[PDB]
Design a protein around this ligand. Structure first.
Ligand code: SF4
Ligand code: SF4
Ligand code: SF4
Ligand code: FES
Ligand code: FES
Ligand SMILES: [Ca+2]
Lengths: 146, 905, 156
């Protein structure tokens, strides 16, 4: 906002955009997009039935678009380097990179950025270092608790 | 639209969802969270059906029928094996935490959860773990709270908050610890909180007044009746057991009061069960009070009345049309007096003239919800005509309904509708002497004396149409508010103007008529609604007669030596000292009434009349609809010494004994025919209900359910010999279960809703043509008059502005839903709910008098000093003092009067 | 008797400036009152409702919906230990046993002197450095049952 990248008349375009940070109060269901909209409106975070989707009538009945942090972090690279660069990062159906990582009693529990189509063995072994000493593999969840 | 359910083709409304479409076709889908008046939310997940994509489809998909539109060419299955298993599983999940409470639960035998547990076929428990429990709250004297029985269907919060506009009920907590109640212990503040006992499908919210003298639904004797506690005319089902009025249930009327009553009509019935009611005719001889039977009372009264030179009759707006007519025929038309005051009668006749000569349609109570802008002039609707206030709230939410309909959102998708129309609402402009309960949704509230509210109405009418008389002396800020109201009213397709006689001002009604005429001249679809005071105020106004002041003048001058007072305490319409003097001077006072009133001390004869629960008759509501109410029980079934007859029966027998020295009692339809022959304006009351010869395939209409119990033991302590079943020669109903209460029976009067498998109030679905619509063969009740071809002229007499004169205090009426109606004060449960009576003062006037909040001030009206504490009313205009109308010692006739010598005691 | 302070009212009103509906500042108003007073007392619900122009039942439903808004009195320091799946694999049970041994209380209870309130909590988003705990504003990772008694004494 000090540098003029946010607020009124952003870089001479005349587009006005105001960005706020709304801190939550500790509930897992608030991550659901309609429950997120309900929580943003100061209500109990019950989800909503779709249709209508939030693109038609979301926050306060207005058109609303909800996106993840990583999607909006993938956006500027697309807008700065081009569509054809983003389509050619990985030779798979899913384009672009993705934050992947193995956690829980591994040698290197962390987070890395990998192209789509990376097999799960390379994340476990070539990046996380495999399992720890004296522990053998039993199971894995690919995308979180759900 | 065309749907195919289980291989059968049906034609349905495409705007409906699948659940209400299938319930209207007679199919049984279990459901909890959906209500016809509240819309669909998809919470309970009970209404699952299997939808197929095409006719040649085997897999399908489980969908919520309440959330799925009944579009053309739909294919669904209710009795699919997977759908049945899922519905049974949902019932089983609800049963895991449910308490073992049915024997000691007031909902037992009337429980929707019981019916859906049986309907899904779930009777085997495999859950073996602990059940969650909850502490209960104290919700006031009317609603009992038991949160263990909750199934978290969210119907209470949806009704109370979204529909009723209440604020003190909510849902708290989380995952399976969801709690439905108030944030703290205390009385539920909504005037329509009593509908929770029918909205809640379990026994969480129950009728505490019924729970005192509890009995099950199958043990009740029901009758279709009309609520007598104001002029709206809501259809009710009173239910009796062991000779006392046990409960008032909502009787569905798709035109009037569809699913909801107000708390005054639901809990104000306790005056029927009072022990001081007259049960036998009593004749006063010196200091002795001898008890007569009916024939001795008729003979003695006839002899004394025949000795008299002129007997006058004083009717009442409490009494039915037939009883007022019978009194009018007994004393003669020239000697009949309406029991209300001259100003009250003038306002009532003006309201009737506006309704049936103004050329503007008057809506029924259900039709009020379809209007686009509402102007309320003078009438505190929530305290005098509460169900009209609820309908006005629905009409206000109509704007969000239209905004969502513009985005192709179905009418049953209530969450999406409320999300689209966030805080936008249709314009509501209310005027009163102080703040109202409609102020939270009102676009503007005008707190002013009744002259200033009338002037605002006249100014609005002049700004809409310049042919109307103008108001001179309007401040520019008030002029800007007037222009806001005019722009909102002129842009409305269906404006509605609501006034009434409770403001105590003729000019307010005249201003409302002028606004309605100005809107009619612009081509708008304007409606007008007048709120009267009592259940048969409009019937007494149509019948006509002299005022109470003329009757008291006739008694005081000696031209009348006999007075017959019909169901009237006479102190609410005239000063008590004048009434007592005129009645003490009269050598014969005969009081026909069902309540122990103060004028019976001066009465030479007291006829023990029947209340509405023990009588049949017709009442005309505020919209001019004639409605028949039927007797619930025989008062003489248990106490054989009780001689308590209908008032028209008493007066007709008295007239017969006066004329021919012989006692003929009557039949009810005979009195109806006499009314429609003598008074042509009341000719519509013949078609309000069919006569006593009406049958359903040869059989009468049952008053009590098929499983009515204890028939050989309920009276066995008095005598082991069973008594003769009480005969009903008056109506088509029978005082037994030997009759018809089929949902498909061709009738409009339904005593109670029961269907096999549907024991709760959801059986009204079986009794309707479509669910949430009208009754299957029409709603009962017939409008007495049509809309007039031509209208009235503009009322030229614009009043001057209110001027506070020194030493005189204008009485501003403050009405209370619990305390202003005469008979509901007598109900013992209302005393804990009735507010303590104070006097309202402006801060400036209280500072001028040197009085604070709570100190006692004494004032004299009609030479009688009474003392009251003080509250400081900020919204009350200075020069006015606010008084609670209809309370003990404060008559409703005091509205618009003046006060002298009001000073600190 | 509850009375909102001037700083609390100013912060709440500035939060209502951020939204097109004043109801949307209810969670932040409850968090402001909780930050100022440790928890949300009974009169704070009615005070926040009066400031925001919404019913008190809505404020109470919001306050009882969210687990991080305390409607019961807590201690001067709130320990929130993660009991989710990755910290279960990394062994939060030893941490919980050490906390219950040192504080001599159960989860959901507070200490006798009002110093500590022990609470389980959902995943803290620090699963690669588990097990994790959150004392009042500081998150601690790589927890061991031996380091818990040392870590507790730095919160007086
Ligand atoms: S609410 Fe219904 S199912 Fe529950 S205890 Fe009462 S009668 Fe039984
Ligand atoms: S209290 Fe009754 S109406 Fe409210 S959610 Fe529970 S079961 Fe439904
Ligand atoms: S609005 Fe009037 S008629 Fe209807 S239930 Fe209430 S008191 Fe009775
Ligand atoms: S009635 Fe459809 S989910 Fe509740
Ligand atoms: S599982 Fe404990 S921090 Fe995520
Ligand atoms: Ca009868």
């Amino acid at each position: 906002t000090e540098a003029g990248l946010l607020g009124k008349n952003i870089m001479g375009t005349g587009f006005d955009f105001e960005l706020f940070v709304h801190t939550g109060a500790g509930r897992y269901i608030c991550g659901e997009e309609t429950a997120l909209i309900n929580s943003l409106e100061g209500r109990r975070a019950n989800p909503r039935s779709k249709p209508p989707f939030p693109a038609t009538s979301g926050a306060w009945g207005k058109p609303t678009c909800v996106n993840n942090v990583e999607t909006l972090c993938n956006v500027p690279a697309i807008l700065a380097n081009g569509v054809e660069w983003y389509q050619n990062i990985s030779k798979s159906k899913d384009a672009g990179t993705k934050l992947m990582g193995f956690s829980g009693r591994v040698k290197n529990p962390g987070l890395w950025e990998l192209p789509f189509g990376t097999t799960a063995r390379e994340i476990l072994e070539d990046y996380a270092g495999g399992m720890r000493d004296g522990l053998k593999f039993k199971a894995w969840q690919p995308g979180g608790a759900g | 639209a065309t749907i195919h359910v289980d291989g059968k083709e049906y034609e349905v409304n495409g705007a409906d969802n699948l659940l209400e479409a299938c319930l209207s076709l007679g199919l049984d889908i279990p459901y909890f969270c959906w209500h016809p008046a509240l819309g669909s939310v998809g919470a309970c997940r009970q209404c699952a059906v299997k939808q197929y994509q095409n006719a040649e489809d085997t897999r399908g998909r489980l969908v919520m029928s309440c959330m799925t539109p009944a579009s053309d060419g739909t294919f669904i299955s209710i009795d699919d094996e997977e759908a049945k298993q899922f519905r049974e599983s949902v019932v089983e999940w609800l049963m895991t935490n449910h308490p073992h409470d049915c024997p000691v639960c007031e909902e037992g035998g009337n429980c929707h959860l019981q019916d859906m547990t049986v309907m899904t076929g779930h009777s085997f428990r495999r859950y073996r773990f602990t059940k969650r429990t909850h502490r209960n709250q104290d919700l006031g004297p009317f609603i009992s709270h038991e949160m263990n029985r909750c199934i978290a269907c969210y119907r209470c919060v949806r009704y109370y908050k979204d529909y009723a506009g209440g604020t003190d009920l909510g849902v708290y907590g989380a995952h399976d610890n969801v709690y439905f109640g108030r944030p703290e212990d205390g009385t539920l503040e909504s005037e329509f909180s009593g509908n929770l006992v029918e909205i809640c499908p379990t026994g969480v919210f129950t009728d505490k007044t019924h729970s005192e003298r509890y009995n099950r639904k199958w043990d009740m004797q029901f009758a279709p009746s009309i609520c007598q506690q104001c002029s709206i005319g809501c259809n009710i089902s009173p239910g009796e057991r062991y000779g006392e009025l046990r409960r008032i249930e909502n009787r569905y009327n798709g035109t009037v009061n569809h699913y909801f009553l107000c708390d005054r009509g639901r809990f104000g019935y306790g005056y029927v069960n009072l022990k001081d009611r007259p049960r036998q005719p009593v004749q006063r001889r010196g200091d002795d009070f001898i008890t007569l039977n009916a024939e001795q009372a008729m003979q003695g009264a006839a002899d004394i009345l025949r000795q008299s030179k002129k007997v006058i009759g004083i009717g009442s707006p409490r009494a039915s049309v037939e009883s007022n007519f019978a009194l009018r025929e007994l004393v003669g038309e020239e000697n009949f007096y309406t029991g209300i005051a001259h100003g009250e009668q003038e306002r009532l006749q003006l309201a009737l003239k506006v309704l049936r000569e103004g050329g503007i349609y008057t809506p029924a109570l259900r039709e009020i919800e379809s209007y686009d802008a509402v102007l309320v002039l003078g009438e505190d609707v929530t305290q005098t005509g509460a169900r009209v206030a609820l309908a006005v709230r629905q009409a206000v939410k109509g704007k969000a309904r239209e905004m969502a309909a513009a985005q192709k959102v179905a009418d049953w998708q209530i969450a999406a509708i409320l999300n689209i129309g966030q805080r936008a609402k249709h314009p509501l402009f209310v005027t009163n002497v102080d703040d109202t309960r409609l102020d939270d949704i009102a676009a503007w509230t005008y707190r002013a004396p009744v002259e200033d509210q009338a002037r605002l109405g006249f100014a609005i009418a002049h700004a809409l149409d310049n042919s109307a008389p103008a108001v001179d002396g309007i401040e520019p800020e008030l002029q800007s508010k007037i222009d806001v109201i005019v722009q909102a009213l002129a842009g409305a397709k269906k404006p509605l103007i609501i006034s009434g006689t409770n403001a105590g001002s003729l000019e307010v009604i005249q201003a409302a008529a002028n606004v309605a005429k100005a809107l009619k001249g612009r081509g708008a679809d304007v409606g007008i609604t007048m709120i009267a005071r009592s259940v048969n105020s409009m019937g007494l106004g149509i019948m006509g007669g002299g005022s109470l002041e003329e009757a008291l003048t006739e008694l005081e001058t000696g031209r009348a030596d006999a007075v017959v007072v019909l169901e009237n305490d006479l102190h609410r319409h005239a000063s008590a000292t004048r009434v007592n003097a005129a009645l003490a001077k009269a050598p014969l006072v005969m009081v026909v009434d069902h309540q122990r009133t103060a004028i019976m001390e001066n009465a030479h004869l007291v006829l023990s009349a029947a209340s509405f629960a023990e009588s049949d008759g017709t009442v005309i509501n505020n919209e001019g609809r004639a409605q028949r109410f039927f007797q619930v029980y025989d008062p003489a079934y248990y106490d054989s010494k009780t001689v308590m007859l209908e008032s028209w029966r008493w007066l007709h027998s008295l007239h017969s004994t006066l004329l021919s020295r012989e006692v003929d009692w009557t039949q009810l339809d005979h009195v109806i025919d006499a009314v429609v022959a003598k008074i042509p304006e009341l000719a519509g009351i013949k078609d309000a209900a069919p006569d006593a010869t009406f049958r359903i395939r040869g059989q009468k209409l049952a008053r009590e359910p098929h499983r009515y119990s204890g028939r050989t033991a309920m009276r066995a302590n008095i005598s082991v010999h069973e008594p003769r079943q009480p005969q009903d020669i008056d109506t088509m109903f029978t005082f037994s279960m030997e009759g018809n209460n089929q949902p498909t029976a061709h009738r409009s009067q339904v005593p109670f809703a029961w269907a096999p498998g549907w024991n709760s109030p959801q059986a009204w679905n079986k009794f309707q043509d479509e669910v949430g619509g009208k009754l299957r063969f029409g709603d009962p009740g017939v409008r007495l008059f049509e809309t007039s071809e031509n209208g009235l002229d503009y009322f030229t007499s614009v009043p001057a502005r209110f001027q506070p004169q020194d030493g005189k205090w204008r009485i501003a009426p403050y009405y209370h839903l619990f305390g202003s109606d005469e008979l509901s004060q007598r109900a013992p449960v209302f005393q804990s709910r009735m507010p303590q009576p104070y006097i309202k003062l402006n801060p400036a006037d209280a500072a001028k008098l040197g009085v604070n909040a709570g100190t006692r001030v004494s004032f004299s009206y009609d030479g009688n000093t009474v003392t009251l504490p003080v509250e400081i009313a900020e919204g009350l205009t200075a020069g006015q003092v606010g008084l609670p109308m209809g309370m003990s010692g404060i008559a409703p006739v005091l509205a618009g009067a003046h006060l002298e010598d009001l000073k600190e005691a | 008797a509850f009375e909102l302070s001037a700083a609390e009212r100013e912060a709440i009103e500035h939060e209502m400036h951020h939204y097109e509906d004043p109801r949307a500042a209810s969670i932040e108003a409850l968090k402001i009152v909780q930050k100022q007073r440790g928890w949300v007392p009974d009169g704070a619900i009615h005070a926040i409702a009066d400031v925001l122009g919404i019913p008190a039942s809505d404020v109470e439903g919001v306050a009882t919906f969210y687990s991080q808004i305390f409607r019961q009195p807590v201690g001067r320091h709130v320990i929130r230990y993660c009991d989710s799946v990755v910290c279960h694999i990394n062994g939060y049970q030893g941490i919980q046993a050490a906390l219950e041994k040192k504080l001599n209380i159960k989860p959901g209870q507070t200490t006798f002197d009002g110093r500590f309130t022990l609470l389980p909590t959902c995943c803290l988003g620090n699963c690669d450095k588990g097990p994790n705990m959150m004392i009042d504003e500081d998150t601690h990772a790589h927890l061991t049952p031996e380091a818990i008694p040392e870590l507790l004494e730095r919160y007086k």
